[model samples]
Target: SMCNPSACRAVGRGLQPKGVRVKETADFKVYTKGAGSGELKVTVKGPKGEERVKQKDLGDGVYGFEYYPMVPGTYIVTITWGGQNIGRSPFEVKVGTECGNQKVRAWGPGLEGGVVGKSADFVVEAIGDDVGTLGFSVEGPSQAKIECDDKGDGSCDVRYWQQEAGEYAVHVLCNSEDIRLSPFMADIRDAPQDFHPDRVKARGPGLEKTGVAVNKPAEFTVDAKHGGKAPLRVQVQDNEGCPVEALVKDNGNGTYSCSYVPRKPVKHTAMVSWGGVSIPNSPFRVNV
Candidate 1:
């Protein structure tokens, strides 16, 4: 652990894991704060001195890193104290599926990647204005600064990040190589909230067959013969995602008819607001 047991430089010049075997990923914040308020710089490199990402002076000690392994592999991520010209510290991230009841992996998932579920890899996008050096030092669910062993070489394997699935953050001035930012984790045993089996539309009936008029501005009516459990609010939104026009009319038997005189023929998407959430747009094309 970098900052947990006290902000200490990770105990390795290269990929030497302090304790990172409990999870699939680990995240850490790297950056040092100075008195009177000042900026800090951090740099990171890959193996063979290739694929280097650097971050400039950050006031909040920016640069946060995260890691997830698809399979059992050796990856190294190095962090330099400054820009390309500053001092450097090497922390190797050894990502394995080996799960034991030890604190060796304080920030990693106890379950190995593909152990029995789908583990998605994510890319670490550079969000800050500067590109600080990238590296990691785990603290929780597992312990240790990550280590990366590339092709039998001992230098930091910075290039493992080439794969979009292996994204990491570069927190500024992490207390030595120990301060952890995010805990490495595996997907929940149950289905993740954001997921869909996916269904494709088979075919569409031409509007000409059911339209009162092809391109005429006629009154549009919607009848809820058997209203569904959810209340629906219909609105006409333009291609730019703006509501160009709207209509609120009453139907005879609790149904509704919305009538609007659209002077121009505009391509719009039918937006159905249901159950407090905006439903996905239904493609609507107007020829008028």
Candidate 2:
């Protein structure tokens, strides 16, 4: 029987589109599917040079190939069977900078504790020049909605709100690898009172007008007297989800004076919540 190059299949992380990191071994497998014997060859070319990769017989009809890339750049891999180019013979691999989990740092109030009905927030920063994809999750009494905003500066803002009071585990990962202090434990407690978030009232130009000037403080008031006495959370983020400075003043009464300065002319979101519940029209849109 003769070997069929078209019938052979190749698969592995070595062929990943995102590429591999320099100094890391990239491996893949070629399944011959019991197709008879033939001379198989694998060649890898990169910035360093070009060379044939030795293949190891994994089992019946399967051969494995491994290559350790020493340079950061694009690599081309070519395979041949019986002097003929195999299916998808030429594959492109990307060699990138190595990112270590130790180079990542995460911290915030959310990692330590959270309110039963309030959103918990934290920040994750990739301290090294090589930063991979950032991923995170929250597991607790109930499924919490997790939101991550990339600041475009090797840092991310993560937020999650739990409905049931219990213990939670927050996992922060980089490149699918656990960071230094991953799986942070947080204790979630119940709200002070059973009150609807909408019962809280908010007013002023910050929430009503669109002509708020940039770099100037846009002030507003929040009245939670009827909703009950609870901790208030006020945050302002730009269109890209990057946080803006928000100043909230608790007026001895059940009201709060909140102010924020818009740095850009784009739209901003002013999020106000009481005891983890959002007030009526909580995310008021402000245009600078």
Candidate 3:
């Protein structure tokens, strides 16, 4: 029954309470600010912040996030605005027979991170089933022109220039599928900066011309910096970190490496487990 001041109270027949019977299931929605488009996201967490339930992304900023008072315990419902992050908002909700269905979507462009330089040539669409009223709104960082075909004609001639490098997210509101994102198609001759993956070789051990102890254990490591706009997932592995998937140590260094206790005689076998990603070669054995 408690909610943010900016939220609509649980109502029936479009009226806040006192109008319906007991109100079994409810439908709630978040509208789009007609802002730039990025990845739309939504997540729900348990009261203890242990268990988490999510409706996932169905595209755009539109989402179908719902919760029912299964055991009548407390629950924390979060409505995030990032495509890759679920920590956007720490919204809360109450669950009971009086509780109803709830839906949420990105509210604005900066809600997550507006398109780099507000570069998203925006468009909005609301399609699904017999739900309710739908609308669209757009606010950019510059003199950007926007066009909308609220009637679903499929042809958008809107054009503008955005040289910023932030977040670009799209949103749509539908009656059946809840809030969603409209199709994204843009040619950003100016898309912020390159945040792609970048590799920075460590200056120690098996570096083509580097030297290491011939009869002792030597520590070696490699670094891979993600220059991409998103987190670059990787897998590092070696004979170390037993029962391991990726043998490399994240070390929280944005780099990965491993230490070995090489044998006093000859070289030992060191193999990296590759997950179709760029391999961070550890030069296998020590000079031993």
Candidate 4:
């Protein structure tokens, strides 16, 4: 007879998810104080099906439920005390296709490398019922300060400028718990140089006859062999003599990379020209 339901203040009132958009996979949880006994029961029924909530008992007047929702729709939750229905039993909750997996996704070059002193932009996405509490963190190299204002849609944006050259950690979380495979790594490069390298080279994606297929992304590595600044530009062309932009990444050292999807099956050529002359193996040909 100790079930004083009124002791549960603000039960199931201000629960909402925060974010511009929600992902198909994510997580959800709820907490309450001085509520039910060891017999407390939690169940969630949604579009896909129904499941018994997994309870984690935390000592010192605390308790929690771990929920990874699948499918999307109305999730009706029930809480019972000692096999007796409580005040908020069978509460109806709404979920969308975005929250199918209850997992968080983060991506972008910020997870890779960016120019030093330049801001690296990233994207974060997740799903939640109380989405309002969703958040992430960007810890710069050498345990520097953390930045937070770049949050966006189901694809939350994260922009962090690199100061020192090294790696940065991107940490993501939801419902006050770290998502699986959280804490991504990022690298930053030093400032670019106006001076050009003595020469550059290219290879990869079948460097000889019948090179990378048409419309297929072909990746090749380039090096200044004593290069200066980053964003080293390389020119790519098809057999028809049409030039296409190659995605380039500065390795921060004398090495770099260039990636481009061939638009045709014909032969192609790649060249890196500076110092008034093309480097050795200039205009490397690839048969698509």
Candidate 5:
């Protein structure tokens, strides 16, 4: 509770305790100003041990030093300038409470699917006071100890090389408890090199030039007899390119049926595409 503004300033231009607070990793930071004019050494002594903290001059009488304590206890912060002790050389910091209830979420490198023979990194985010322990696992790939880092404030970093081609299970834990959606599945698969659009076929009155009453919902089917893949997407858009709500169903084979109601009496296009490519006669026209 050192409220004096001048006291916050280091001996004219040294380390001075302006303010300190608990960071995401449950570490404390002492904010000071006015150390840019000369060289200064800042250190903190806690229950763990005494170590020198990096002193950053933010310019214009603004400086900061971060301290990460292994265990909770009282800490003493001291500043030395020009081989001499500055006014209020030592400031007291009463460390209290460990970081707890940390939330965890894991994601692939760049939040994308992992690939083989490359560095497939994972990011673990732990948020909240007492940021608890976080874990990671890869059920599909070969083993190794993950590099756990909490220096990212409240988050952790787990990095590994993608050696095998399969699905990797990534797990995250908080205080020995599994977080939401824990054991994430990391798909380490290769890109489809010869991937091409499936030649799809459309059937039903929706693809006909004959006009149907506005009250009648449009019905159509996309036939993928070319042996493509599951999950054939169907999008029906009016002549104005506005999407019309539609429910699509997979017939368990290579065909999918779709039913949609057009809001207005107008010509619409039943746009069908899969694997980011258009199917045969994809934009089927409909008159209502």
Candidate 6:
């Protein structure tokens, strides 16, 4: 039988790493077992229109090649055999800084809510030039089963499931540092029935008063007695979607005290949510 390009396999650690530093060689191996008599070609194109091509036989129908990206950006790797593209040809490789936790993004319904005994999934994207060890964890009433799939394009699909119902914290980290919005509060319910967002209420001068001073603590309160049991999520951000840290403390009486320190004299939005749903009068605007 002639060599089948579709049957050829490409494998190697150099193909996909958290983040490949600039000027570092990224490589892969190609196996062509019944390829008969045909030429094998490996072509790599960098972000700056740079291109490198090589074809080396590594003995026993195996071939390999390496490419050193001169800069940080996306690189396209193409492998072909016998004038035809091999399986999963034209791979995308992202090169970035040694560590870029700020560039990592995580989002999905799983980070907000889920049902007990069901799988909750989310997406973590780190397509920027920041690269380091990627880590994920889930802390809740009980241990959760976690799985992550690297898409080889600077992104990962994360799935987690729990056997118990309660609030869970899903953390996405890079090199031990939390990514943007890490430790997301997830409310896992026993069932999908009778969860009310309207029962949650917010009050206090922090949200009612205008002209709040910058770098001063603004206080507010959230009452969730009628909202059932769920995690209360409070976030403050500017128009640019930049997150401001907000401190929330449970009063042990179905109420929460939330506060935030504004650093800039700009209009900001304060969002309060219960069980993944925004409460009434939430997203209040304040002028600092």
Best by lDDT: 2
Off by over 4 Å in 2: 1-136, 141-163, 171-187, 194-196, 239-243
Instruction: Tell me model 4's lDDT, rounded to 2 decimals.
Output: 0.53
lDDT of 1 at 95: 46
What lDDT does each candidate get? 0.33, 0.74, 0.33, 0.53, 0.52, 0.71
TM-score for each of the candidates: 0.25, 0.44, 0.24, 0.33, 0.32, 0.38
- Evaluated at residue 252, the lDDT of candidate 4 is 67
- For candidate 4, what is the TM-score? 0.33
lDDT by residue (109-206, candidate 1, tens digit) is: 11111111222221122222343344443222222233333322111221111112211232212223322332332222232233221111111222
TM match of model 5 to true structure: 0.32
lDDT of 2 at 263: 92
Poorest 10 consecutive residues by lDDT, candidate 2:
10-19
- Return whichever of 3 and 6 wins on TM-score: 6
What does candidate 2's lDDT look like per residue over 183-269, in tens digits? 666767786665545568899887874768888888999987777666788878776637899999999888889999899987777
Off by over 4 Å in 6: 1-194, 209-211
Worst 10 residues of 5 by lDDT: 11-20
Stretches of model 5 off by over 4 angstroms after superposition: 1-198
Q: Ten-residue segment with the worst summed lDDT in candidate 3? A: 11-20
lDDT of 4 by residue, 7-53 (tens): 43213211122221223222232333565443556676666687545
TM-score of 3: 0.24
Clashes of 5: 5
**Backbone collision tally, model 1:** 66
- Model 3 gets an lDDT of 0.33
Best model per TM-score: 2
Tens-place lDDT digits, model 3, residues 1-288: 222222211111111111111222322333333333433444445445544333533354344444433433444544433332232244454433332332322221222222333323322212223345443332232433444433333212132335643222222333433242221212122332554222434434533333544433455565545533333222222223222122346667566665554433333334322211123342233333
